[PDB]
């Protein structure tokens, strides 16, 4: 299948990006930086892992948005997108090959970010009994990939729309502001003002509308011990579908990325 | 045979950006698509590809529809001003494209020698020139056994030695039975290597034929400088009463400006005196025909100096 | 005399990238600088602009130094590929060069009237094409009525109508008395518009003269293209038997390289036997002279149509 | 003169920048935002301490956004090869790109701080109006003078490299260095070095970074949220000479760019 054959390019194009190796090293040295300063200030594991998960609310979009904002429109300025459509491909095989090909980059970024950091934590206590950490970080490594795969797909929606690489970053920095640090911040003020005509108890029953909160919802499941994340503790839904809506924010966003790719 | 276009037309909204185009193409004949203000310099060029759909009629590339992958495996294409993925190496860029077109990987190192890029292989695409990228964009079009090439300005930024043998590479290919389509704006330099022209403007086809056909079509004069012609007077006046202009150049040379409908029979009259003595004919070129057919399309000329 | 390059041997790092050219230029002359595979053309283009220092030599522009501010008001220059200012407007970026060269501001509007840009003036330069940027970059080089131009591939991406009209605008200023230097790589086509060519290679000047001077020096074969002959194979088996490398271009179109002892009487075989529909005698072009003047110095011809 | 003529473009080029008009207005809403809450705290010397930390994070960022493509954006754009053929000097286009970018930064703070200065007139009616000319008037002729250093920082870095993307790699590299590194390594000489390297030559360590001097000139007579600026009363240098090192931090860092541009 040729969807893997375009993904061998974007894996090789992603690893030779100079900025992407800089941020993923900066992700990994801050991955141990919460880990070393969370162990030397302690003596445990789930108390500091929310601060570890709060690091990945910033950088795992910013790894994904730096990697994939110039995938569709970055090949349209180069003209190779017009060349690739003359090649024996579907339109969707370009996008799904870019989504797989950028997808194994940042899957390998958290395996070099968290994987050194979590195995350093097991080699800094020696009596944490490291087999219980596999149920902790294995619930955490999968969600970090599943977070950034949404932000890969949100990058492909914006990069399908715009016509130049310079205005692609103006939407790429816009979505990283809006989803990470604005859409939680509006819900702080929406708690304190919305009580007369719009009841705030009925507010978080359908707060699937920000996946980085769902990234923070899965990483405090059973390990709460917060702020805006206490509103998800009022959910009567189980946490198993809190996985499944985050996987649903890939396929809703990829279908919007596929339909915008057919309008070029 | 290779490309057959039966009366198609194209519209973005309801305005016809291409109107009533009817082309044909043989298996070895190369074709120069020339347009400057009509959209059919590029929207017909996308219509040979599967990039657009024929909204009025239908096209046939190698007897098939142009969206089949069996068509595109034997179809090369080179766009204008293409820059590739600049952090990626040069040899793996072709090794990316050979996996996509289904070409064998043994062809990759041959084609980098065939475009002269082996000294510049295994380097980044950002440290390439304009024409050094144009060798790379040529080389992906030669992948497999490409029956049809579409070259939109293939010689821009190239070396002057590298321009000429590229046409000899094309003349290698059209003698091998693979017809190409050229799309240039620089008209001298493709006119020595084109086989028939496809000049069109204002969204419609103006004229299609050979360069001998269009000078037979357009009334357009030639300049026949015949050096060394003896006796100077009776061979001068004999073209003036025959409907032509004979320049009385005083260095024993008679320059006849004719109408080229009687082209060869004055040329046989130029061997009728026995001493033609290294004559020179100045046919009107491709851009001289391009100035004609805009007036046939109604595009007016400029002032005495504008552009 | 406008440009007097006398004995300039430019080196850096003991490389000798330009070795001892003696290049003069008249007043109404138009010059063609042609060079590749080295820094011959581009450093000599930098030497006449005065932004590169003449190491061991004098470059007398209009009798003066090339870094004087008064000679940079009488000079115009168009570079390689100028994406100018993508947030500026079209009228303002030529107005920006109007105050820079010191021209009057009643010239910037008529130059956008002259060069066909007034329909797209007061628009963003990122919305311009490559042809409109070359339209724009010409107009700053025409600004302030300069006495010396320097155009470095001025017709790339350009309209083929406006490609022809630009050499009319050069010949408008050739009749004004301003010397023009072209630095092209689209060299078939500029030979109808230059007066002298200057081919240089490996940092050394190979040949300078007119095309009558180069064809008298360089003995070249003459391409006799004939289309519409009766049997194509009967002549390709005969012209190769006569000692001429003749090939076919269609099912009936041949061209024959001559020797000019065989250009005349062997052309009598073409008329009275196997009658064509057209005979187009090509002169040895400036592209053909470039292949000779390379192969005097180095760079032997690529095998079987590669590169 | 030629130097105004190149500056008339660059003044009109920065006003048509879509990027700079965003974050100058984001500076302007952040300038009135701290002034609104600082008036809500009534801490009037704590207002100007907090606004100086805001311009520490943004007046380098606006100056680096304005001039990271100021020399190398002319080179890959091809105009720089054209511009030296004009009746100009090499340094005559550096000063004209300096003055033309500099008056944008003067117009950045006059639309940013000056509305926030008159935001005090909207809410605090009864304050000393005559003190505000000494108060916010110390901001306007210092935030430009920090911003003109980062302009001349940008002309050094955009003169050296030969790629517009690599100039952005040194743009945030120099923005992390003089803002969020040099305070931390001087904090590390207090904490990790324990004052055991050299105690007596601690006050000479501040002139190698203009951002603390910008914090020093605004917290010169008013003390308050100092934090890392605990050497401010330790200086034997008066604050009148603290202007002059900042003007020397232009004139060294401007003349090093002209030494770079002379052998570009």
Curated annotation (Swiss-Prot), chain A:
Induction: Induced in response to denitrifying conditions. Activation requires NosR and DnrD regulators. The keyword Transmembrane helix applies. One of its GO terms (cellular component) is plasma membrane. One of its GO terms (molecular function) is ABC-type transporter activity. Its main location: membrane. Keywords: Cell inner membrane, Cell membrane, Membrane, Transmembrane, Transmembrane helix, Transport. The keyword Protein transport does not apply. It is a multi-pass membrane protein. It is found in: Cell inner membrane. The chain crosses the membrane at residues 19-39, 49-69, 105-125, 140-160, 173-193, 241-261. It comes from the Bacteria. The complex may be composed of an ATP-binding protein (NosF), a transmembrane protein (NosY) and a solute-binding protein (NosD). Required for the assembly of the copper chromophores of nitrous oxide reductase. Could be part of the ABC transporter complex NosDFY. This is Probable ABC transporter permease protein NosY.
Curated annotation (Swiss-Prot), chains B, C:
PROSITE patterns: ABC_TRANSPORTER_1, ABC_TRANSPORTER_2. Keywords: ATP-binding, Cell inner membrane, Cell membrane, Hydrolase, Membrane, Nucleotide-binding, Transport. Inhibited by AMP-PNP. Partially inhibited by N-ethylmaleimide, orthovanadate and NaN(3). It is a peripheral membrane protein. It comes from the Bacteria. Induction: Induced in response to denitrifying conditions. Activation requires NosR and DnrD regulators. Residues 3-227 form the ABC transporter domain. One of its GO terms (molecular function) is ATP binding. InterPro entries: AAA+_ATPase, ABC_transporter-like_ATP-bd, ABC_transporter-like_CS, ABC_Transporter_VariousFunc, P-loop_NTPase. It holds the Pfam family ABC_tran. It is found in: Cell inner membrane. Transmembrane segments: none annotated. Belongs to the ABC transporter superfamily. Required for the assembly of the copper chromophores of nitrous oxide reductase. Has ATPase activity. Could be part of the ABC transporter complex NosDFY. This is Probable ABC transporter ATP-binding protein NosF. It comes from Stutzerimonas stutzeri (Pseudomonas stutzeri).
Curated annotation (Swiss-Prot), chain D:
GO terms for cellular component: plasma membrane. It holds the Pfam family ABC2_membrane_2. InterPro entries: ABC2_NosY/YtrC-like (IPR032688). Induction: Induced in response to denitrifying conditions. Activation requires NosR and DnrD regulators. The keyword Transport applies. It is a multi-pass membrane protein. Its main location: membrane. The keyword Lipid biosynthesis does not apply. Coiled coil: none annotated. GO terms for molecular function: ABC-type transporter activity. Keywords: Cell inner membrane, Cell membrane, Membrane, Transmembrane, Transmembrane helix, Transport. The chain crosses the membrane at residues 19-39, 48-68, 104-124, 139-159, 172-192, 241-261. Disulfide bonds: none annotated. It is found in: Cell inner membrane. Required for the assembly of the copper chromophores of nitrous oxide reductase. Could be part of the ABC transporter complex NosDFY. PANTHER family: ABC TRANSPORTER PERMEASE, ABC TRANSPORTER PERMEASE PROTEIN NOSY-RELATED. The complex may be composed of an ATP-binding protein (NosF), a transmembrane protein (NosY) and a solute-binding protein (NosD). This is Probable ABC transporter permease protein NosY. The lineage of its organism: Bacteria, Pseudomonadati, Pseudomonadota, Gammaproteobacteria, Pseudomonadales.
């Amino acid at each position: 299948n040729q969807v893997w054959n375009i993904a061998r390019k974007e894996l090789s194009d992603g690893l030779r990006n100079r900025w992407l190796l800089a941020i993923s090293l900066l992700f990994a040295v801050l991955a141990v930086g919460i880990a070393w300063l969370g162990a030397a200030a302690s003596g445990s594991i789930p108390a500091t892992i929310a601060s570890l998960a709060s690091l990945a609310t910033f950088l795992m979009p910013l790894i994904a948005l730096l990697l994939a904002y110039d995938a569709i429109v970055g090949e349209d300025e180069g003209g190779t997108l017009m060349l690739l459509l003359t090649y024996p491909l579907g339109r969707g095989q370009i996008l799904l090959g870019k989504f797989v090909g950028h997808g194994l980059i940042l899957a390998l970024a958290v395996l070099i970010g968290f994987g050194c950091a979590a195995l350093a934590i097991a080699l800094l206590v020696e009596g944490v009994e490291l087999g219980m950490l596999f149920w902790a970080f294995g619930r955490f490594m999968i969600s970090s990939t599943l977070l950034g795969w949404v932000f890969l797909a949100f990058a492909y929606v914006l990069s399908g729309k715009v016509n130049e690489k310079s205005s692609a970053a103006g939407l790429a920095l816009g979505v990283w502001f809006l989803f990470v640090l604005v859409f939680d911040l509006v819900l702080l003020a929406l708690l304190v003002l919305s009580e007369g005509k719009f009841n705030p108890e009925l507010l978080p029953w359908l707060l699937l509308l920000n996946p980085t909160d769902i990234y923070r919802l899965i990483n405090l499941s059973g390990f709460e011990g917060m702020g805006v994340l206490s509103l998800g503790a009022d959910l009567p839904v189980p946490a198993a579908v809190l996985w499944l809506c985050l996987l649903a924010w890939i396929g809703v966003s990829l279908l919007l990325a596929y339909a915008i790719f057919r309008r070029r | 045979n290779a490309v057959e276009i039966q009366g198609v037309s194209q519209r973005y909204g309801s305005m016809t950006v291409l109107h009533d185009l009817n082309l044909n193409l043989g298996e070895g004949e190369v074709l120069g698509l020339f347009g400057h203000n009509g959209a059919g310099k590029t929207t017909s060029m996308k219509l040979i590809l599967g990039l657009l759909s024929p909204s009025e009629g239908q096209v046939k590339v190698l007897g098939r529809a142009p969206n089949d992958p069996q068509v595109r495996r034997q179809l090369g294409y080179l766009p204008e001003n293409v820059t590739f993925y600049p952090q990626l190496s040069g040899r793996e860029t072709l090794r990316h494209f050979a996996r996509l077109k289904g070409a064998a990987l043994t062809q990759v190192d041959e084609l980098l020698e065939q475009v002269g890029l082996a000294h510049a292989a295994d380097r980044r695409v950002k440290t390439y020139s304009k024409g050094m990228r144009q060798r790379l964009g040529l080389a992906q079009a030669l992948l497999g056994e490409p029956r049809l090439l579409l070259l939109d300005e293939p010689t821009v930024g190239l070396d002057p030695i590298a321009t000429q043998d590229l046409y000899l590479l094309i003349d290698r290919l059209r003698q091998r039975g693979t017809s190409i389509i050229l799309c240039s704006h620089v008209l001298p330099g493709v006119e020595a290597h084109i086989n028939r022209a496809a000049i069109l403007a204002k969204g419609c086809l103006q004229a299609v034929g050979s360069l001998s056909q269009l000078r037979a079509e357009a009334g357009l004069p030639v300049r026949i400088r015949a050096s060394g012609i003896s006796e100077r007077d009776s061979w001068l006046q004999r073209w003036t009463d025959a409907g032509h202009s004979a320049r009385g150049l005083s260095e024993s040379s008679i320059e006849v400006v004719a109408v080229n409908g009687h082209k060869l029979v004055l040329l046989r009259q130029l061997l009728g005196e026995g001493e033609p003595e290294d004559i020179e004919i100045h046919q009107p070129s491709l851009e001289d025909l391009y100035r004609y057919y805009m007036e046939r399309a109604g595009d007016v000329r400029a002032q005495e100096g504008r552009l």
